[PDB]
Amino acid sequence: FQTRAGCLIGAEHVNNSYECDIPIGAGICASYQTSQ
Amino acid sequence: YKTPPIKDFGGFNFSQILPDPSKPSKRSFIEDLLFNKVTLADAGFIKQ
Ligand SMILES: *[C@@H]1O[C@H](CO)[C@@H](O[C@@H]2O[C@H](CO)[C@@H](O[C@@H]3O[C@H](CO[C@H]4O[C@H](CO)[C@@H](O)[C@H](O)[C@@H]4O)[C@@H](O)[C@H](O[C@H]4O[C@H](CO)[C@@H](O)[C@H](O)[C@@H]4O)[C@@H]3O)[C@H](O)[C@H]2NC(C)=O)[C@H](O)[C@H]1NC(C)=O
Ligand SMILES: *[C@@H]1O[C@H](CO)[C@@H](O)[C@H](O)[C@H]1NC(C)=O
């Protein structure tokens, strides 16, 4: 999923938004959730 | 929070400061003028 900060691999993009847990940057954050 | 549609602020005007829905960036009039006045460099948004 291309992003402003660069390129990520291994994760999955979602539309729902939450409070950031691990700031990736440029309005992008990572979180581990369900399945998991 | 968000501003209500009405502006019955005893005649006080905040137009230049309150966000303008028309502009994509909701920077106030004053803030947009400030950004224009400033001359930044190296935005870094995947620069060629
Ligand atoms: C809080 O502050 C704002 C900004 O002043 C007020 O919004 C209007 O602002 C104008 C002048 O700035 C007031 O005067 C008259 O406006 C009429 C039409 O208003 C709009 O016109 C265009 C629309 O794109 C805008 O440029 C303008 O800012 C208004 O949004 C016109 O009879 C005159 O405006 C003319 O101004 C210049 C030429 O001098 C050009 O933009 C146009 O040719 C335009 O026709 C006139 O100057 C107006 O009365 C203000 N109120 C309105 C439109 O409702 C807010 O009203 C004010 N709010 C409070 C509570 O004070
Ligand atoms: C939802 O996700 C997919 C792709 O991620 C796509 O429909 C669109 O980007 C998003 N639309 C909404 C309303 O979230």
Which structural class should the secondary elements of chain A be placed in? mainly beta
Give the termini distance of chain A in whole angstroms. 19 Å
Overall, the morphology of chain A is: globular
Largest sheet of chain A: 2 strands, antiparallel
Radius of gyration of chain A: 10 Å
Would you count the extended β strands of chain A for me? 2
Strand content of chain A: 15-25%
Instruction: Give a list of the ligands.
Output: a molecule of 5 linked components (NAG-NAG-BMA-MAN-MAN), 2-acetamido-2-deoxy-beta-D-glucopyranose
Classify the helix fraction of chain A into a percent range: under 10%
PDB class: viral protein
Keywords: SARS CoV-2 full-length spike with Lys1269Ala and His1271Ala substitutions in the coatomer binding motif, viral protein
Entry title: SARS CoV-2 full-length spike protein with Lys1269Ala and His1271Ala substitutions in the coatomer binding motif, 2RBD-up conformation (SPIKE-AXA)
Chains A, B: Spike glycoprotein
Task: Summarize the entry for a quick read.
Chain A: This is Spike protein S1. It is classed as viral protein. With about 35 residues, chain A is mainly β.
